[PDB]
Amino acid sequence: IETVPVKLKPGMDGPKVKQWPLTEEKIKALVEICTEMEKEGKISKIGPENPYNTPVFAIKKSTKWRKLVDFRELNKRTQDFWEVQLGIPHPAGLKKNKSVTVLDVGDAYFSVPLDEDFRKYTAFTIPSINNETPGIRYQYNVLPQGWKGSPAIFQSSMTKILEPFRKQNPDIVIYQYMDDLYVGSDLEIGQHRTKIEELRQHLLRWGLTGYELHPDKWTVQPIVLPEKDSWTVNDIQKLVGKLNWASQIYPGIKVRQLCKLLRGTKALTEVIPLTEEAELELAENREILKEPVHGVYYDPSKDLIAEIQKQGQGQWTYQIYQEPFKNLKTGKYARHTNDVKQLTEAVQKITTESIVIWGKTPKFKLPIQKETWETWWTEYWQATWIPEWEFVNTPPLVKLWYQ
Amino acid sequence: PISPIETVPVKLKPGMDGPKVKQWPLTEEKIKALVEICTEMEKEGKISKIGPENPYNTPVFAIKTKWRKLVDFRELNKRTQDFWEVQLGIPHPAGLKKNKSVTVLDVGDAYFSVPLDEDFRKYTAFTIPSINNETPGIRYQYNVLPQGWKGSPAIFQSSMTKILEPFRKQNPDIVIYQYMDDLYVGSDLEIGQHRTKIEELRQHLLRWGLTTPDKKHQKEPPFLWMGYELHPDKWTVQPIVLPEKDSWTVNDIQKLVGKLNWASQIYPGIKVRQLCKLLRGTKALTEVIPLTEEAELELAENREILKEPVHGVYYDPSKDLIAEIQKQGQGQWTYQIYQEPFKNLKTGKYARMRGAHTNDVKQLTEAVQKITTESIVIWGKTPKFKLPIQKETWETWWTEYWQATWIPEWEFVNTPPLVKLWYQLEKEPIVGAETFYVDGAANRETKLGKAGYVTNRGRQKVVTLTDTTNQKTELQAIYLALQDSGLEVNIVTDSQYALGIIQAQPDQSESELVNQIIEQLIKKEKVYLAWVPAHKGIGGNEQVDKLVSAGIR
Ligand SMILES: Cc1ccn(Cc2[nH]nc3ncccc23)c(=O)c1Oc1cc(Cl)cc(C#N)c1
């Protein structure tokens, strides 16, 4: 099979990312996996003349250990190839479907050889305990799982594999994002589940051997205003602040009447009777809050940002935007689950939604300690992709403004 | 011997050519020494004579009783490609399993025992100049890995890996530690089967041009390796001698700290905070630093720890690791790792400052992360923790904190001082407590400011400050209200900065203003802190704003 030449972006070159320490069990799982891939010719041992490195981890999903290569740096360094040169158009219909099934299709890539002059950039190391031995180093001879260039090259083969199925089912949306297929329909749940089984058989004939979303049922988490009888000084202070903030993002928010009620140096606990003008503006603000943001639109040339807040008792809120308050989507996540397990689950849910909606993973702003997250994320991770992340300190007031 | 192993294909950096650096005319005595060295090396196969068609050159030098040849590979090293970073981490003794028999095999003339890619040999060209540089020089190039060259450590290690591979596949119950040009071989076999398996190893290595010491030349325990002592059933750091001196210079304290830091991996309780504090202040090496009372006390406690020797035990993979942490004092933490009660594998300390304002609960979790990581490196597994924190203290903190926080498997251990939260903030406003509306304002030009409050019960105050910031004035305002209030307080601020600091329950700060605030918060019975936006005509906020703005803004 003839390889497609991968032309790395000018100036900068390959990734030189450190391998993070791995537990004994994960190391062993990786050595067994890699021995096999080496025998099957998928990967081959490398010399020290290869200065490149990308991290490797071991996840589950399953009782089976699976290898996960972090190609985040390689992907950034090949952006011209997979996004502009080659490029998978994202269907706007996918988010409108009653059902979206997610299919792991990454096993396809190993039947397609990688350009001989690009293999060096796919280098990774299996580390050892207490640095007994230098790490086991390998590079790929086939399209690697996790590299954005893989579905880009495999596009043509994927189109052929899918042509009959698509022709027979013209109202089924099939989208390929990295190692997965997103299959959407407006069929009855039983019929949808039947059509995906049919598609698996088509996949099965080429080699390639689910996860069920409901996008039409995806609703916003509006900024909620308290619905109460007796309003305290604190309560309205809390309201004006919540409302003063929403007025930056939402067009048409009014506060003058509510603000007007707070006159003089009063005690926080003092119950102050409401006016039937202030009651009208909160009713109008409520009405704006339940609706989408006016004037906020997706720009394909700009990165997506996701911010998460720990709300306590297994609940988490999140927002997706490109401009710091001009937010495209806001939602929530609910849970023996611990904080890292919960945050891992939430980052993955938000990411699947971003893929469905925009065809782009967001850049996360995680309210955790880098090191905690670095040691722990792999224990609960189950996706075949990894999004980008930053470590932040949730501003105290952002949390309460979102429930 | 020069290994018959396959060569590593070395390349120069993209868009770069080899070095072409002129040889400087040397003394007759230097030229003579180089000629002797080089002819010997040439007979050995290490270097070969070249024609004058090769245009590359690296300078040579002879230093002195014997003469050593020194090749300056600075230019070639700048043109040679980047290599894979050798081994990122070194073996820790505590991660070593206790083996029945262990032998150390150093490889003799390591670099010289491994060939250099034929296509790269041209770039190692050097010239022995003729007397007064009249006649053309004697030109040579390397056939083996040259000392001082960029690729040598990587290419050697990689060749040694390739060679050991078949032996590793057929002898899985034999540990081989690969460190630099040494091999550390351990087995759980009786003397005889190990002395045999080592000869088989020594022999397998000879088939590959690699020479190692024989039984009479092989080192005997205890091994003095990398500042450690490796004994048959224990390990320790080599002798630490704390210098006694009248006057301590910057260099003396620097060396002391290093020695103590090194000793900290086995000797529990080592403290270095007061010694470190002396080092901040740009003073010169030779400059004498008088010790503080506290540094003297810290040194004394350390001399006591070091008095009698301590050792660490090796690793048993069939057993779990227990890690115990103790609060040593301010910002200082000490830990011990063991499998069998009080027979430590290793010890250590944590004494960091993550931010400007923190608490013991945050510090404890930071030390648990540091220990966890360290365990993965050394043993490939996390330890079980024994922490001086009550489960109730932990769940109260985790539950109410904004950050995702997590300690893996733990148990409380009643080892004082215990970890606690020194104060708690109210969730709802207090009935029958005075409501202080606090504000601060600082003129950015004059650097002057005012801080004050207006209460719901008619009170008022305003203090002038001279070398301030808005952040400092807003914190002063909080302090003011905490000082002039009762034992129950409702405080309303427009500063998210201040709100943020206080909501985090700090018990220690770099800021004295924050430590003064903490002292007040602990004293108090109930405190409720609320926030309002600034400059919007909100209640008592507009009133403090005008009060503090007078003259300021
Ligand atoms: C391969 C090996 C295994 C266990 N022990 C720990 C041990 N088990 N049994 C022993 N018997 C005698 C002495 C130590 C012993 C060792 O020391 C050892 O050799 C080394 C490892 C390192 Cl990092 C540096 C040096 C060096 N130089 C030697």
Structure description:
It is classed as transferase/transferase inhibitor. Keywords: HIV-1 reverse transcriptase, non-nucleoside inhibition, nucleotidyltranferase, K103N, HIV-1, Transferase-transferase Inhibitor complex. The assembly is dimeric. The entry is titled "Crystal structure of HIV-1 reverse transcriptase (K103N mutant) in complex with inhibitor M06". Chain A is p51 RT. The complex is a heterodimer of chains A (403) and B (553). Chain A is of the alpha+beta class and 403 residues long. Chain A has 4 domains: 1-84 and 110-150, HIV Type 1 Reverse Transcriptase, subunit A, domain 1 (HIV Type 1 Reverse Transcriptase, Chain A, domain 1); 85-109 and 151-215, Reverse transcriptase/Diguanylate cyclase domain (Alpha-Beta Plaits), CATH 3.30.70.270; 216-320, Reverse transcriptase/Diguanylate cyclase domain (Alpha-Beta Plaits, 2-Layer Sandwich); 321-401, 2-Layer Sandwich (Alpha-Beta Plaits). Helix content of chain A is 33%, strand content 19%. Chain A has 11 helices and 14 strands. Chain A has helices at 24-39, 72-77, 79-85, 149-168, 189-206, 233-249, 256-260, 278-289, 339-357, 370-376, 396-401; strands at residues 43-45, 56-60, 65-69, 99-104, 124-126, 136-140, 173-177, 180-185, 211-213, 305-312, 315-323, 326-334, 363-366, 388-391. In chain A, the strands form 4 sheets. Chain A has a 5-stranded mixed beta sheet. In chain A, β11 (315-323) and β12 (326-334) form a beta hairpin. The longest helix of chain A is centred in the middle third of the chain and has 20 residues, at 149-168. The radius of gyration of chain A is 25 Å and the shape is globular. Chain B is of the alpha+beta class and 553 residues long. Chain B has 5 domains: 1-86 and 112-152, HIV Type 1 Reverse Transcriptase, Chain A, domain 1 (Roll); 87-111 and 153-221, Reverse transcriptase/Diguanylate cyclase domain (Alpha-Beta Plaits, 2-Layer Sandwich); 222-315, Reverse transcriptase/Diguanylate cyclase domain (Alpha-Beta Plaits), CATH 3.30.70; 316-422, Alpha-Beta Plaits (2-Layer Sandwich); 423-548, Ribonuclease H-like superfamily/Ribonuclease H (Nucleotidyltransferase, domain 5, 2-Layer Sandwich), CATH 3.30.420.10. Helices cover 30% and strands 20% of the residues of chain B. Chain B has 13 helices and 23 strands. Chain B has helices at 28-43, 74-79, 152-170, 193-206, 250-263, 273-278, 293-306, 360-379, 391-400, 470-484, 496-503, 512-523, 539-549, and strands at residues 47-49, 60-63, 68-71, 101-106, 126-128, 138-142, 174-179, 182-187, 223-225, 228-230, 235-237, 322-327, 333-340, 343-350, 357-358, 384-387, 410-412, 434-442, 449-455, 460-465, 488-493, 508-509, 526-531. In chain B, the strands form 7 sheets. In chain B, strands 14-13-12-16-17 form a 5-stranded mixed beta sheet. In chain B, α10 packs parallel to α12. Chain B is elongated, with a radius of gyration of 34 Å. Chains A and B meet through α1, α6, β10, α9 and α10 of A and α3, β7, α8, α9 and α11 of B. The complex binds ligand M06. The ligand Cc1ccn(Cc2[nH]nc3ncccc23)c(=O)c1Oc1cc(Cl)cc(C#N)c1 is lined by residues 91, 96, 98-99, 102, 104, 175, 177, 184-186, 221, 223, 225, 230-232, 314 of chain B.
